[PDB]
Amino acid sequence: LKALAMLSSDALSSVAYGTEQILIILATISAAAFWYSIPIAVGVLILLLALILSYRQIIYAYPQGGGAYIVSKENLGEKPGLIAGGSLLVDYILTVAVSISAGTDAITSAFPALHDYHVPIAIFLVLVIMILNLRGLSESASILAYPVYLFVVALLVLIAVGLFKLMTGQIDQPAHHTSLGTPVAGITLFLLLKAFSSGCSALTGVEAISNAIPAFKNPPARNAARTLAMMGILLAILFSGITVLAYGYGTAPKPDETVVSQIASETFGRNVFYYVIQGVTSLILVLAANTGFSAFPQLAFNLARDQYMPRMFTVRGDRLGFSNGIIFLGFASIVLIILFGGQTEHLIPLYAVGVFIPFTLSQTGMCMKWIKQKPKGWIGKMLINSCGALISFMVLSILFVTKFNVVWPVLIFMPIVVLLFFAIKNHYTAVGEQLRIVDKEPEEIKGTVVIVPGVTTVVQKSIHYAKSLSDQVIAVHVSFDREQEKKFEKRWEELNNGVRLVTLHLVHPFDKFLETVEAKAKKEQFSVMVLFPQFITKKRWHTILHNQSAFLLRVRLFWKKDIMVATLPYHFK
């Protein structure tokens, strides 16, 4: 069909948290008489129109379509362009944190008795999304694509009946502010732009369609651009309908419920249809967290090349770093939920800074790319991108110069990631310049000893493979607290074996024996090799509790020694 839902779930889920909650909280904490919801909503829609035309330009200029990092690096260089990668990391961590925190704030308003603990509902929803991305690995075409349609039709029919109730001359909240003009004391243009900055976080979703272009099965232009156009107009009318209903009634920002909850409550009764609205909004915020997890590894893959991430992300979702990426994203999301509670009123400036550093850098890089050449309608596209850069930059600077008590994790976390990316690049240059040389051949050692550490079928199998693979093999076993080691040697010899054994009488005597046999290795020009066994079950749960003592301990011991180890599996059946 179409399948725009895996990206529209990140886009149009912001009609619940960063729209009326944060904006109306700032307007009430000024003077408790708000009427600037409609002009700031129109200003946010104007900034949305600027961003959707700028990303139409970026998609029409890149059919490859990797947005917000590749353009920044290739049109800014190295020291910038990489900060776009760091801020997309902060945006991914915070989109799963903020989407889950607003999901719990919209699920502890249908059943408000469990609002005492709602930090450990957030960690539970992060954990079930992390599990269903790890072991389930669904990525299906029904569960990820039906609730966005249900949400759009649900909020549409709610906006229809709510504007119908606000119409036909009926008052449904007799307390109501003015309509036109009537300024209120204690309100500056600085505070109005403060509310415009904090309420600008409704449009943090178009980055998802600019960062997840491929698998369209058509020409890339004129199709994904029109998908982005439909998503932009749907977010526009949805956010405008929710803010015109919240200005329509009283709708104070109560510190236990959201704004869409109060809209549904005073619109269509307490509990008849209201439960499907809170249900579908919790589901949509959960799917937005899933889109954050799903769009992590494309950034990780675009940064693994050019030697900035660990190298393991080069396979693009063939399960190497997808596990480590999912675990890191979940752990940083959980520690941010813990540091900020299940609040979704403090994390919104963090998430907006994390999404409006990449918009700024992407627009500046597109501006420099359009100032490099003058091909086709030059000054118009240049002014569109530069004005978008200006308005995103003033949004970032307003969100940074205040709320500085919450955005200290960005100022800490960004130079750590930039310094680490520089260190990984320097390390891979040093490895590529020290390694990849032309040398000679070694001694051609022509002789190898095989060491193996009760008389057991696995022990006799491993010592048979030892005698097959080499000669002069040595069996050892650690002996303590009794006299049975002489009895063990006795029953060994007169039961099965005739091979050589040199027992001992824990780590320290073992590394002493290995150091002595390494002393009998260098001038003798003969190498050394230790063979281990491994017990392998069938039920896949007994990976623990069988071999993870000797294996882990002696593999930890077997560094700085230059002795090759080997494992032989038994595979219990």
Under the binding rule (CB under 8 A), the answer on residue 433 touching a copy of itself is: no
Q: What sign results for the dihedral spanned by CA atoms 58, 63, 65, 70?
A: negative
Tokens 């749960």, residue located: 541
3 state SS of 270: coil
3 state SS of 566: strand
Under the binding rule (CB under 8 A), the answer on residue 426 touching a copy of itself is: no
Binding residue for a copy of itself (CB under 8 A) from 135, 376, 436, 482? 436
Binding residue for K ion (CB under 5 A) from 22, 89, 201, 207? 207
Q: Which does 314 bind (CB under 5 to 8 A by kind): a copy of itself, K ion, none?
A: a copy of itself
- Span 272-291, contacts to K ion by CB under 5 A: 288
Under the binding rule (CB under 8 A), the answer on residue 184 touching a copy of itself is: no
Binding residue for a copy of itself (CB under 8 A) from 64, 456, 472, 516? 456
Tokens 């180890």, residue located: 565
178 vs 167: CA distance, rounded Å = 17
* Residue 571 buriedness (CB in 10 A; 0-12 / 13-18 / 19+): exposed
Under the binding rule (CB under 8 A), the answer on residue 169 touching a copy of itself is: no
DSSP 524-542: TT-EEEEEEEE---SSS-T
- Span 488-517, contacts to a copy of itself by CB under 8 A: 506-507
Q: Which does 566 bind (CB under 5 to 8 A by kind): a copy of itself, K ion, none?
A: a copy of itself
For the chain, the first-to-last Cα distance in angstroms comes to: 47
Distance of closest approach, residue 245 Cβ to a copy of itself, in angstroms: 33
Q: Which of 288, 363, 325 has its CA nearest to residue 125?
A: 288
DSSP 107: T
Under the binding rule (CB under 8 A), the answer on residue 434 touching a copy of itself is: yes
Distance of closest approach, residue 56 Cβ to a copy of itself, in angstroms: 31
439 vs 272: CA distance, rounded Å = 80
Q: Which does 2 bind (CB under 5 to 8 A by kind): K ion, a copy of itself, none?
A: none
Question: How many residues touch K ion (CB under 5 A)?
Answer: 7
Binding residue for a copy of itself (CB under 8 A) from 170, 180, 457, 482? 457
Question: How many residues touch a copy of itself (CB under 8 A)?
Answer: 69
DSSP 168-222: TT--S-S----SS----SS--HHHHHHHHHHGGGG---HHHHHH-----SS-STT
- Residues lying near a copy of itself in the complex (CB under 8 A) are found at 117, 119-120, 123, 310-312, 314-315, 318-321, 338-339, 341, 424, 427, 431, 434-437, 439, 441-442, 444-446, 448, 454, 456-458, 460-461, 464-465, 468-470, 506-507, 527, 529, 531, 535-536, 542, 544-546, 548-549, 552-553, 558-560, 562-569, 571-572
- Residues lying near K ion in the complex (CB under 5 A) are found at 10, 13, 91, 99, 207-208, 288
